[PDB]
Amino acid sequence: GYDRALSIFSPDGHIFQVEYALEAVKRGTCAVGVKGKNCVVLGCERRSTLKLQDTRITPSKVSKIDSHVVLSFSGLNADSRILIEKARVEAQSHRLTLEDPVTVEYLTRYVAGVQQRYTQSGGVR
Amino acid sequence: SDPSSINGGIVVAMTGKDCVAIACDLRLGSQSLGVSNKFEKIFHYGHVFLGITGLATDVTTLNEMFRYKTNLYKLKEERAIEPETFTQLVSSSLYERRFGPYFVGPVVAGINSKSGKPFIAGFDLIGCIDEAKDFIVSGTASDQLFGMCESLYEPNLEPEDLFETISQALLNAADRDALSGWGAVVYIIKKDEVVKRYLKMRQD
Amino acid sequence: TQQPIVTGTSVISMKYDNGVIIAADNLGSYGSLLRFNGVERLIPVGDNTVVGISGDISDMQHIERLLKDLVTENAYDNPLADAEEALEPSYIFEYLATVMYQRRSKMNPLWNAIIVAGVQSNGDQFLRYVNLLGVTYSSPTLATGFGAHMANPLLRKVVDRESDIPKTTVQVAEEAIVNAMRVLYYRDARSSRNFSLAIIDKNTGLTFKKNLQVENMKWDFAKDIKGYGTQKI
Amino acid sequence: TTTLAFRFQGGIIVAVDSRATAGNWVASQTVKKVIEINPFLLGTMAGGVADCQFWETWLGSQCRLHELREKERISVAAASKILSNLVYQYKGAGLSMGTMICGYTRKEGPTIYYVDSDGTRLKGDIFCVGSGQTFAYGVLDSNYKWDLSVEDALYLGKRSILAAAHRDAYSGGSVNLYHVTEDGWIYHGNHDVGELFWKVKEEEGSFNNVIG
Amino acid sequence: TSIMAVTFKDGVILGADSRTTTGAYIANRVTDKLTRVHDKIWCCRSGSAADTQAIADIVQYHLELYTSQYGTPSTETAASVFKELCYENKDNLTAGIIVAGYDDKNKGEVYTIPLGGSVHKLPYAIAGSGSTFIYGYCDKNFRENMSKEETVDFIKHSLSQAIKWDGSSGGVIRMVVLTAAGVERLIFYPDEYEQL
Amino acid sequence: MDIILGIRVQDSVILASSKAVTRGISVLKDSDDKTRQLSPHTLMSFAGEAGDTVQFAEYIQANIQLYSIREDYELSPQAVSSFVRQELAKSIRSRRPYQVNVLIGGYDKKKNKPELYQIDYLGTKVELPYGAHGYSGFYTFSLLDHHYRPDMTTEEGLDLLKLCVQELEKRMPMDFKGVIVKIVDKDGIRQVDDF
Amino acid sequence: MDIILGIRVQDSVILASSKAVTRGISVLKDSDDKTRQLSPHTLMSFAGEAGDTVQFAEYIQANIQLYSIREDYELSPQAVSSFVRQELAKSIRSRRPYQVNVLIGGYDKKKNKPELYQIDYLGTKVELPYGAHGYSGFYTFSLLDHHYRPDMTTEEGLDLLKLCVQELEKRMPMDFKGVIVKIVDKDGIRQVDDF
Amino acid sequence: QFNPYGDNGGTILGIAGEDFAVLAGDTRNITDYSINSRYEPKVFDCGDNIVMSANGFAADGDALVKRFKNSVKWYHFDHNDKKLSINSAARNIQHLLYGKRFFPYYVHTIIAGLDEDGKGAVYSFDPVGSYEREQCRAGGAAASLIMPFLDNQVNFKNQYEPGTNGKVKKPLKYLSVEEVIKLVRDSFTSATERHIQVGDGLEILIVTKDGVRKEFYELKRD
Amino acid sequence: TTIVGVKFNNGVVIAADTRSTQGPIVADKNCAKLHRISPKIWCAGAGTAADTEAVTQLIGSNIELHSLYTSREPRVVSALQMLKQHLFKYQGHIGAYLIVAGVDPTGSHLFSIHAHGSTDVGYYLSLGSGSLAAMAVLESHWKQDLTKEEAIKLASDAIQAGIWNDLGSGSNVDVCVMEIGKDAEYLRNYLTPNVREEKQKSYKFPRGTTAVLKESIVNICD
Ligand SMILES: *[C@@](C)(CO)[C@](*)(O)[C@H](CC(C)C)NC(=O)[C@H](Cc1ccccc1)NC(=O)[C@H](CC(C)C)NC(=O)[C@H](CCc1ccccc1)NC(=O)CN1CCOCC1
Ligand SMILES: *[C@@](C)(CO)[C@](*)(O)[C@H](CC(C)C)NC(=O)[C@H](Cc1ccccc1)NC(=O)[C@H](CC(C)C)NC(=O)[C@H](CCc1ccccc1)NC(=O)CN1CCOCC1
Ligand SMILES: *[C@@](C)(CO)[C@](*)(O)[C@H](CC(C)C)NC(=O)[C@H](Cc1ccccc1)NC(=O)[C@H](CC(C)C)NC(=O)[C@H](CCc1ccccc1)NC(=O)CN1CCOCC1
Ligand SMILES: [Cl-]
Ligand SMILES: [Mg+2]
Ligand SMILES: [Mg+2]
């Protein structure tokens, strides 16, 4: 198996691969979240250099993780699908064992834990 | 389906100074289910006492059989049967069913009216006589009774003291056995008086 | 899960004032067939330990190879291999006891009963038993198979407890062993006349006696025995 | 064993005996068959002692890890399901367990779950578990009402174990009582059947089958 | 057991070891397996000790009652009575018996009766668990019309080997000579026969 | 066959017996009377192996009726119970034993007392204030230990019996289709039609 | 576990499932719901080995719910039934197979038709107008062969179902403590509270 | 077919006092009807004032003691030479036993020592790891003989105050070390009389705050 | 059980231990295993206890009737023949293992009988679970031309070997000497090397310790 440590420290105490991953987020389309007194709203930008698009079938920017939680993102589109899939599976697993849907904090903690694991595992970016 | 441990129960006997004692519990059950708490296991034919443990139907049958036989004995002999002689009769009757036996553990106790000597005996299911100076045990808690008797017993105990020893032997043995208990009876037997006492014990 | 094929019968042993004695016959039985007659079942380890083995012979030969290899491995990087860091009887036993219990726990035992006899570096007598189940015990006298039933009673008349060990000489001890072997020839149907004996003394060391025979036997009274009950001829 | 627990107006009553057996040998009369998982959760034990004792104490460790991770006490449902999912993994291997997980939480209220070694998990108001469960049911069912007082409910639980202790050969020793409220579980003492039987017989006038 | 019977010029000789076992324990090391059913008609017993003894006792009773009415019975007649008991009770018996006897008309004769209860007249016969190891030896060394000394040596050497290889055989070698002269008992001890 | 119960009160003996007869996965009948009158003041209920039960009950009935005619006299409940026990005690060591368990309820006219006897297929006899055969006892005995008193009336005994049937209908796995109830007292034997 | 029934009528599918849970000689519960909603218009009832039943039902439930979230779309009853069959077909050659029999009732919104599937623990699937698992079928199939028509209403289907339960309560040996009834149609899944 | 279990006989006994605790056991070792050794100890000092005995199949017994002794050694290495309390030892032993739940150690285990308040403590285990603290326990071949005697003499079971109409029980009290040793000796002589696998010798280990003392007594050798 | 028989100059001697077992439990500590068939013919019995007593009493009864019928003292071979044919008929189901010995007009005799009905002759014999321990002693110390006192010593020594080494055997040694021309002497408890030591404590209870519910006088008279 491919083992190489890709995410490592530099002399100044930075992990460049993690910081360069932030640059990919900066390149991505804008996404905003605002919460009111009795609601939350998620807004997302879509770039207009792409005409002749089919909006029926094109992957939407906001994804349902469960019937009560949603997830939007900024950055590499392909990478986001992997996180969304893992989150959706964990959501159903939680309902199965705890007999209660996930809290938003719990779901976030899981997704964040996956992202962290990919910063100190060999052979992955 | 082990005939000797379906119903449960115990019997113990002891000797003292010019006296004998025989005791038993009152339980009759069907495996885990307790059914009756009035099922006495000690019987007597004249001055000779017989205790029987094991399969309850055979306990009843053998009592009825030995009443039958001792009644005829007395009519022909014109005297009461003695413990030594009755012991031989029990042995003969059990061995007669060698290859289809009564599933029982009998115990004889009494005082010979001629000599005055205290006498006890035990048997296995096919009739082997087990004579003893000190004590005889029988039933589903025989291991427990053997341990209690071997430590508590001393020779030449007075009737009042002997009562305490045999009662404590039975009670503490019964409480370590699931199929024994639910009450107890003790018989103190002197040359020409016999006292019967019911013991207070835990009812579980 | 095994069944034993070629088998060896009793191994007997005891302690005396200055050391230990051990013996076993030279037979390799194939069921009722007395197949092999030149089989040595006492195996020395150094000049201070003898291991006597009964049961399956193929498993015995495997244990021989393990002991042989243990000597080799102990000599590696060990300047004191023939002195302070030599193999003790207690080391050899504990190794075998470990193996026997591990094999039974894997449901694939070495089908044997083993007695390790020897003298320690401080002069103390060593005698301990181990079998296919991994069961271990020690006693002034030890025996396997039929020996346990017939030899032990005879050997316990000489040494009945610990305090009888200083009062027992090597002459008296050997006499009792040799007698016990004769009794086994009379009464064990898988024994032979030929046997080996080994003495380990704290002063005179290891003495290994081969090709011994059972002698001074009583058979003459057989001529007087006729029939099985009422026959007079 | 005989164990029970029932739900009522004033919370949950839990009652157990204290006998342990190996065949007909009475091995102990003083065994603890209730396990205190936390101030709001209880577990009852029937079947194999080692199995029950080992895995229910394991269950407590898993419940403690939940509240450390989630900053909140575990639900009775989630606690019972950890145990039922564990024993399901071992299904066929020969584990022997009849357990009841009892407790109170805000979202659930007073709750009882039956969990056993062949994987059965059931929510319910009344359960009796063990070799003497039928004897306990007989008394409990015939005297149960939802509107029982705390005092009367405690007694009925005690009296039901006593009934089983008397008739079942593999039940006895003493009765251990527990009451579970919105504030947590409360212990209501150890009661020896040696003294309790006669006390109940005299005061109540019951047990006329026995020689007084 | 190892047992055999051999005919020769002057009559017939029976031979046997003296070992009785329970598993691997020797219950008797000086057993007599050669047993009299009539003056000059004997038998070698193998198999179950209880069965063979009970059979031999019944035969001896039959031949004693035969003699009282019809005089001395033939060796064939004796074998027939053994057969009748062994065959009709084959389901309940474990007995391998050799029958041997001396007539003046018929001289020496040997009948063997295996487990099934069949009868076989032979010049010589071997049986028992130890016999398996000496089929080769006995076939190569047996001659007809041997002398007394030659026949004693043949049986001694044969049983020696049977004993050497069979764990269920051992002890002393008992023999019984049957001739016109009478009945002679011989015994041979381990120190002699082992080093042959 | 399955459920048979018995309760002895002050002045009477009450027997309750299930009405169902089931073979395989089919309830063949729901009105079966599992009892026989042995004499005017003695009643026997029964349960066990198919065929054996009725064959045994009627055999006992015939023998007791024969005795009554011969002596012009009614045997006591104690005497009848002893006869039945001995017949079962003989049976257990036969080539093919009777697999039948019975309850005998009777009123002794000489003693003016009700009597209830429980006898199993081995010939194990006991006199009891209340009794049951089979799995029924695992519920009813503990219940009766609590609610039973020795000085109860017949009406009180019927209410006590309703409490047993209700519990069995709640906790028993099989549908036994209710019970037929009969009372034995000084005036003989009668059936309760509405239960 | 024991009794599960299913009937497909003109515009709906009706599932009836027994409420009893019995272990040994004790009915531990009389209000057990032997079903799980897999999706808004699909319902699965189940019966079989203790533990296996609920474990299997919830495992299927989780997988179908996962699919719904991923695709934002409801799988057809036919598609769900095929997924369930394959899982049971895998199971039967495992080290320890799931011993669970199921009925799947659903309303296909694209076809505007009700559908009922019967699947056993081996993975044997069939689409049927009416179905049953276990010993229930030995009574209900012949009954439905007589009284069932394809154009019946939901109310007619409920009366037809009452006729089945009545027969089972008359002839079945065990007390199954009644049934919970649920209807699946164009408007989803609902429970009948008074049956 | 190979049978991995055997029975080595013998019996063991543990009693606890106010400031002490004893663990006794006979020295006889047997297989079937033969004696293997008249003196083969099976009660061991395991360190930290904890004594232990695992009676039944000797090979499993030795293995368990060996593993617990080693568990004490590593407890010191990993937790700065901290003393392993009797309650902690008991829990650790449950895990040792239950680890082989599906191929069990065939033994009855008893440990003895002082608790953290200095008071006497006795714990007892079944073959698969259940445990319970008690004042009193007998284990092994003669357990059924000795245990009921202990209920009567240590815990005063079935004994009432004379003249009180069986209403007042005999009050519980701690026994002196002298009185306890008397009960142990009598228990084993009685067991020797009526059980064939018990005899030869008796070895008692006493545990106080001062340490672990030994006493030996002869038993009948038949 | 351990039982033996030894021949000497002018007769024969037999011996036996006195332990009776019930599994691993000692039922009787001093039971008699030496049986009288006739005055000068005696029997040592091992195996099933009820069978050995019943078979010895039946043959003993028939031997007495035979003796009276023939006006002759009974012979050992007659007892032997009657025992073997009875045991054979029952195909081993009557579990009696006997050593038969005695003196009669023909001389002194020593035989053994097994349960299936086979018999053996010998100068020295041993039966029972401790027969191997006893036979080891007999094979070691037996010689031709033993005196009376030498034979008693050898026989009791062989029984002792069984007592100490066999778990099936124990307690005391019983002996019976049968010499030609003299009465047979039955030496009950010839050796008693297993006396129970003094107990450490008296377990005499204070009067009133046991709780009582009812008292009543029992009528034994007519
Ligand atoms: C009521 C009292 C009856 O079931 C309860 O159900 C209690 C449950 C409470 C205490 C948690 N159950 C028992 O007491 C339980 C019944 C039982 C027995 C065996 C298997 C399953 C259930 N008893 C036990 O678990 C006893 C506990 C005491 C201390 C002896 N343990 C044993 O019987 C052990 C271990 C059993 C075992 C399980 C799995 C694999 C192997 C073994 N067995 C022994 O100690 C062996 N035996 C004791 C008798 O002496 C010879 C050796
Ligand atoms: C050689 C040994 C083999 O051919 C000879 O044939 C001799 C014949 C001589 C003695 C006439 N055979 C034996 O010694 C014979 C071997 C034998 C064993 C079992 C069945 C058939 C043959 N041994 C015996 O007959 C002994 C004699 C006793 C010890 C004095 N008897 C037993 O071993 C009995 C036999 C019971 C029996 C079984 C089947 C058919 C008939 C009888 N068996 C036991 O006592 C069982 N024993 C219990 C303890 O465990 C070991 C076995
Ligand atoms: C030594 C001890 C063993 O080599 C001796 O051989 C002695 C012989 C003397 C006493 C004559 N043998 C015994 O002590 C003998 C051992 C034994 C056990 C079982 C079968 C054969 C031999 N003990 C007995 O025979 C006892 C005698 C009692 C203690 C007075 N009897 C039992 O143990 C009976 C055996 C009954 C039996 C029936 C059918 C076939 C064979 C044997 N068993 C019981 O009593 C056990 N159980 C008690 C509960 O009720 C049911 C029976
Ligand atoms: Cl023979
Ligand atoms: Mg109870
Ligand atoms: Mg002994």
mmCIF file of N, CA and C in Angstrom, chain D residues 3-41:
data_model
loop_
_atom_site.group_PDB
_atom_site.id
_atom_site.type_symbol
_atom_site.label_atom_id
_atom_site.label_comp_id
_atom_site.label_asym_id
_atom_site.label_seq_id
_atom_site.Cartn_x
_atom_site.Cartn_y
_atom_site.Cartn_z
ATOM 1 N N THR D 3 -36.867 -12.162 39.125
ATOM 2 C CA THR D 3 -36.732 -10.703 39.088
ATOM 3 C C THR D 3 -37.972 -10.088 38.454
ATOM 4 N N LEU D 4 -38.363 -8.906 38.924
ATOM 5 C CA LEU D 4 -39.439 -8.153 38.275
ATOM 6 C C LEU D 4 -39.215 -6.647 38.305
ATOM 7 N N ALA D 5 -39.950 -5.958 37.443
ATOM 8 C CA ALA D 5 -40.049 -4.509 37.483
ATOM 9 C C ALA D 5 -41.337 -4.095 36.793
ATOM 10 N N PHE D 6 -42.048 -3.143 37.386
ATOM 11 C CA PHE D 6 -43.271 -2.632 36.780
ATOM 12 C C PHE D 6 -43.364 -1.112 36.869
ATOM 13 N N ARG D 7 -44.095 -0.541 35.916
ATOM 14 C CA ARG D 7 -44.283 0.902 35.809
ATOM 15 C C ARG D 7 -45.609 1.254 36.470
ATOM 16 N N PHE D 8 -45.666 2.409 37.129
ATOM 17 C CA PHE D 8 -46.904 2.865 37.768
ATOM 18 C C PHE D 8 -46.917 4.380 37.989
ATOM 19 N N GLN D 9 -48.061 4.883 38.449
ATOM 20 C CA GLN D 9 -48.283 6.313 38.714
ATOM 21 C C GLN D 9 -47.064 7.047 39.293
ATOM 22 N N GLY D 10 -46.412 6.436 40.280
ATOM 23 C CA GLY D 10 -45.297 7.063 40.994
ATOM 24 C C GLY D 10 -43.904 6.635 40.560
ATOM 25 N N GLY D 11 -43.789 6.050 39.368
ATOM 26 C CA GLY D 11 -42.484 5.706 38.791
ATOM 27 C C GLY D 11 -42.316 4.231 38.465
ATOM 28 N N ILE D 12 -41.179 3.665 38.871
ATOM 29 C CA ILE D 12 -40.866 2.255 38.628
ATOM 30 C C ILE D 12 -40.463 1.558 39.923
ATOM 31 N N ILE D 13 -41.037 0.380 40.160
ATOM 32 C CA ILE D 13 -40.593 -0.504 41.234
ATOM 33 C C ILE D 13 -39.755 -1.619 40.618
ATOM 34 N N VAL D 14 -38.645 -1.950 41.274
ATOM 35 C CA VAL D 14 -37.780 -3.048 40.855
ATOM 36 C C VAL D 14 -37.515 -3.938 42.069
ATOM 37 N N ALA D 15 -37.720 -5.245 41.905
ATOM 38 C CA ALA D 15 -37.537 -6.208 42.991
ATOM 39 C C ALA D 15 -36.890 -7.497 42.486
ATOM 40 N N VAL D 16 -35.955 -8.031 43.271
ATOM 41 C CA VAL D 16 -35.227 -9.253 42.916
ATOM 42 C C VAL D 16 -35.007 -10.132 44.147
ATOM 43 N N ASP D 17 -34.738 -11.417 43.922
ATOM 44 C CA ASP D 17 -34.293 -12.307 44.999
ATOM 45 C C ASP D 17 -32.758 -12.304 45.039
ATOM 46 N N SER D 18 -32.157 -13.169 45.856
ATOM 47 C CA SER D 18 -30.700 -13.163 46.031
ATOM 48 C C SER D 18 -30.063 -14.558 46.068
ATOM 49 N N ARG D 19 -30.706 -15.541 45.443
ATOM 50 C CA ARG D 19 -30.178 -16.907 45.427
ATOM 51 C C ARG D 19 -29.342 -17.178 44.175
ATOM 52 N N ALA D 20 -28.288 -17.977 44.337
ATOM 53 C CA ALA D 20 -27.510 -18.503 43.212
ATOM 54 C C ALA D 20 -27.398 -20.015 43.361
ATOM 55 N N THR D 21 -27.538 -20.738 42.250
ATOM 56 C CA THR D 21 -27.546 -22.201 42.280
ATOM 57 C C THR D 21 -26.632 -22.830 41.233
ATOM 58 N N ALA D 22 -26.137 -24.022 41.557
ATOM 59 C CA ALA D 22 -25.435 -24.884 40.610
ATOM 60 C C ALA D 22 -26.117 -26.250 40.647
ATOM 61 N N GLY D 23 -27.110 -26.434 39.783
ATOM 62 C CA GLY D 23 -27.982 -27.601 39.860
ATOM 63 C C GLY D 23 -28.881 -27.475 41.079
ATOM 64 N N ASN D 24 -28.850 -28.484 41.948
ATOM 65 C CA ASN D 24 -29.601 -28.457 43.205
ATOM 66 C C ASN D 24 -28.787 -27.908 44.379
ATOM 67 N N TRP D 25 -27.510 -27.617 44.143
ATOM 68 C CA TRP D 25 -26.647 -27.031 45.166
ATOM 69 C C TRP D 25 -26.916 -25.530 45.278
ATOM 70 N N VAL D 26 -27.332 -25.091 46.465
ATOM 71 C CA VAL D 26 -27.523 -23.670 46.737
ATOM 72 C C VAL D 26 -26.153 -23.059 47.018
ATOM 73 N N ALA D 27 -25.613 -22.346 46.033
ATOM 74 C CA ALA D 27 -24.251 -21.817 46.105
ATOM 75 C C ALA D 27 -24.153 -20.541 46.936
ATOM 76 N N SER D 28 -25.188 -19.709 46.877
ATOM 77 C CA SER D 28 -25.221 -18.473 47.654
ATOM 78 C C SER D 28 -26.652 -18.033 47.947
ATOM 79 N N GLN D 29 -26.817 -17.306 49.048
ATOM 80 C CA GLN D 29 -28.100 -16.714 49.426
ATOM 81 C C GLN D 29 -28.038 -15.184 49.439
ATOM 82 N N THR D 30 -26.878 -14.616 49.103
ATOM 83 C CA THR D 30 -26.617 -13.184 49.302
ATOM 84 C C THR D 30 -26.083 -12.483 48.047
ATOM 85 N N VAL D 31 -26.504 -12.946 46.873
ATOM 86 C CA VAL D 31 -26.028 -12.384 45.606
ATOM 87 C C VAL D 31 -26.784 -11.108 45.253
ATOM 88 N N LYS D 32 -26.046 -10.091 44.807
ATOM 89 C CA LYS D 32 -26.643 -8.851 44.309
ATOM 90 C C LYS D 32 -27.048 -9.024 42.848
ATOM 91 N N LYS D 33 -28.348 -8.935 42.576
ATOM 92 C CA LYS D 33 -28.875 -9.125 41.221
ATOM 93 C C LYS D 33 -29.316 -7.822 40.551
ATOM 94 N N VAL D 34 -29.145 -6.700 41.246
ATOM 95 C CA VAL D 34 -29.373 -5.384 40.661
ATOM 96 C C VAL D 34 -28.023 -4.693 40.516
ATOM 97 N N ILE D 35 -27.812 -4.040 39.378
ATOM 98 C CA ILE D 35 -26.573 -3.314 39.138
ATOM 99 C C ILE D 35 -26.876 -1.825 38.970
ATOM 100 N N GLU D 36 -26.166 -1.006 39.738
ATOM 101 C CA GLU D 36 -26.350 0.442 39.729
ATOM 102 C C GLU D 36 -25.444 1.060 38.667
ATOM 103 N N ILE D 37 -26.015 1.313 37.492
ATOM 104 C CA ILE D 37 -25.256 1.783 36.331
ATOM 105 C C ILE D 37 -24.923 3.271 36.469
ATOM 106 N N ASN D 38 -25.923 4.060 36.849
ATOM 107 C CA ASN D 38 -25.714 5.447 37.265
ATOM 108 C C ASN D 38 -26.860 5.854 38.202
ATOM 109 N N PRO D 39 -26.851 7.098 38.722
ATOM 110 C CA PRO D 39 -27.939 7.495 39.632
ATOM 111 C C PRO D 39 -29.371 7.422 39.064
ATOM 112 N N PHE D 40 -29.507 7.260 37.748
ATOM 113 C CA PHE D 40 -30.817 7.177 37.092
ATOM 114 C C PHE D 40 -31.070 5.867 36.322
ATOM 115 N N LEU D 41 -30.091 4.958 36.293
ATOM 116 C CA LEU D 41 -30.215 3.689 35.555
ATOM 117 C C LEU D 41 -29.944 2.461 36.419
#
